Amino acid sequence: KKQCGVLEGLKVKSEWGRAYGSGHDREAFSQAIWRATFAQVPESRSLFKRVHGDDTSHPAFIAHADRVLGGLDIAISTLDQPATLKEELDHLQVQHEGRKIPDNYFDAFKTAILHVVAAQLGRCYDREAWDACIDHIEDGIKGHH
């Protein structure tokens, strides 16, 4: 849709700062996001069987979630500058390549993030912008192609 750009980056990078937050807000922010993801594609629960995907509230999974957002953080936070972002994305690219993950799931996970973020930021939040960037970040993980 939207391929992403310097300003739209700065915006998402900033807004993400507010939505991500810390402490419990985080432990929930992630929680909410995953619940929204799995609710969309229950099929995907099978992939996180290793980290108690059956019970979204299990510490193992809580860790996992909080751990995932972590990467997304680095992505968003890095992305402003192309030089570095490039690297992080590439790094991720590797941790993913080899492994089949349909583009169907990533789509849901994006939607999840977006809906939750919107719920968290109340009013100041540009949808298109996030969509565009979350996309660029995901592409960098799928290799898409």
């Binding site: 310097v6 300003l7 700065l10 915006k11 100041c124 540009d126």
Partner: protein, 147 residues
């Protein structure tokens, strides 16, 4: 005419979003992006800044300049609550441009358009009108001697 107090408050806030951190990085890119729009529309003005080496965008001799401009604007806005002082520095700011041979009354109306096109892109919730209003009052007086 004189500017509404609410509008001033609006701007005194809108600005706090572009100025932002104490960092140069951000303010730089913005003020730059502003000038790039001034030059794309009034290319003549470009020449005026050879003194600061605009031919070397990342120079630093120039970057610093951009900052001074930014900060000079910052200083203005952050004075909107002290009228009397603003009214004076506002003059002093004119004199610093009248002695700069080649600066037209037009180039200013031009940089004004610049912000009004840039700012609404670097931050959301920008009251373009309110900005425009108080920015004009500021510009008018800055030119004002000059012509």
């Amino acid at each position: 005419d004189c500017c509404s107090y609410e509008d001033r408050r609006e701007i005194r806030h809108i600005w706090d979003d572009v100025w932002s951190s104490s960092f140069t990085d951000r303010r730089v890119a913005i003020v730059r992006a502003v000038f790039d729009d001034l030059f794309k529309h009034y290319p003549t003005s470009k020449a005026l800044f050879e003194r600061v080496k605009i031919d070397e965008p990342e120079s630093g001799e120039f970057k610093s300049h951009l900052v001074r401009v930014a900060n000079g604007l910052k200083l203005l806005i952050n004075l909107l609550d002290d009228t009397l002082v603003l009214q004076s520095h506002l003059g002093h700011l004119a004199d610093q441009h009248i002695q700069r041979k080649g600066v037209t009354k037009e180039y200013f109306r031009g940089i004004g358009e610049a912000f009004a096109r840039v700012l609404p892109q670097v931050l959301s919730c920008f009251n373009v009108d309110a900005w425009n209003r108080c920015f004009h009052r500021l510009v008018a007086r800055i030119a004002k001697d000059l012509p």
